[PDB]
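Students often ask what a 'structure token' actually looks like in practice. Rather than answer in the abstract, let us consider NS3 protease, a protein of 197 residues. Its sequence is given first.
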Amino acid sequence: SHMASMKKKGSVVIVGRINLSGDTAYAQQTRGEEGCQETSQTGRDKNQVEGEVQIVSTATQTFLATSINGVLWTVYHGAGTRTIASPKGPVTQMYTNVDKDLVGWQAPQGSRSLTPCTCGSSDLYLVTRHADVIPVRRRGDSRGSLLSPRPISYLKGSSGGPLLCPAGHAVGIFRAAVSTRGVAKAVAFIPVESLET
Ligand SMILES: COc1ccc2nc(C)c(O[C@@H]3C[C@H]4C(=O)N[C@]5(C(=O)NS(=O)(=O)C6(C)CC6)C[C@H]5/C=C\CCCCC[C@H](NC(=O)O[C@@H]5CCC[C@H]5F)C(=O)N4C3)nc2c1
Ligand SMILES: [Zn+2]
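Now compare that with the structural description of the same chain:
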């Protein structure tokens, strides 16, 4: 049967975190590939969630997700409409806006949220999936220039991650990057003003 064969997409799965709790940022893995794949099909994740910045994966892609205002946020171009695995099964998005490249699920129990920035700073810090902290000078409301131009491979797979102000508040989450000749020159982010409700 055609219809009896039709499968459902898996869930997004938290497979790690970027620990920002001390004086040193570092990535932690909390689930390997096989467990990720199994957890994606069942949607049941018994792992204890911690921190603000999660490493997340689908069957095919991996990226980041950041908790702000009690919502775990990430990019639509990573997560699409997918549910997220939780200790109680798959959890449906409570926010979806493809026009902002944004989705959100209720923050997992045990997680913490970052504080939205109110400083109006232009000195930003992008945290990557590799726990690199990359100085960015803000350009207007939703863009930023890299102070230090690195290869664009350094930024691949960090969408959903936070841009932070000097005090560690969330200014937005990383959405896109602009390069020239393969060197990253600027970034676009979803302002924290939209990361609420
Ligand atoms: C499908 O529904 C939608 C809805 C809205 C929507 N909105 C945007 C902007 C969009 O873009 C897509 C995905 C996004 C991306 O790659 N995001 C990053 C990442 O890391 N992704 S990822 O985590 O690897 C991944 C893929 C999730 C797992 C962080 C970069 C890092 C490196 C980029 C490498 C080369 C790619 C350069 C692109 N450049 C660019 O578009 O610049 C724009 C154009 C001019 C201004 C500027 F904003 C770019 O950055 N893109 C291309 N797709 C969609 C799709
Ligand atoms: Zn701030």
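One point worth highlighting: Residues 33-42 form the longest helix (10 residues). Ask yourself how you might have guessed this from the sequence alone, and why that guess would often be unreliable.
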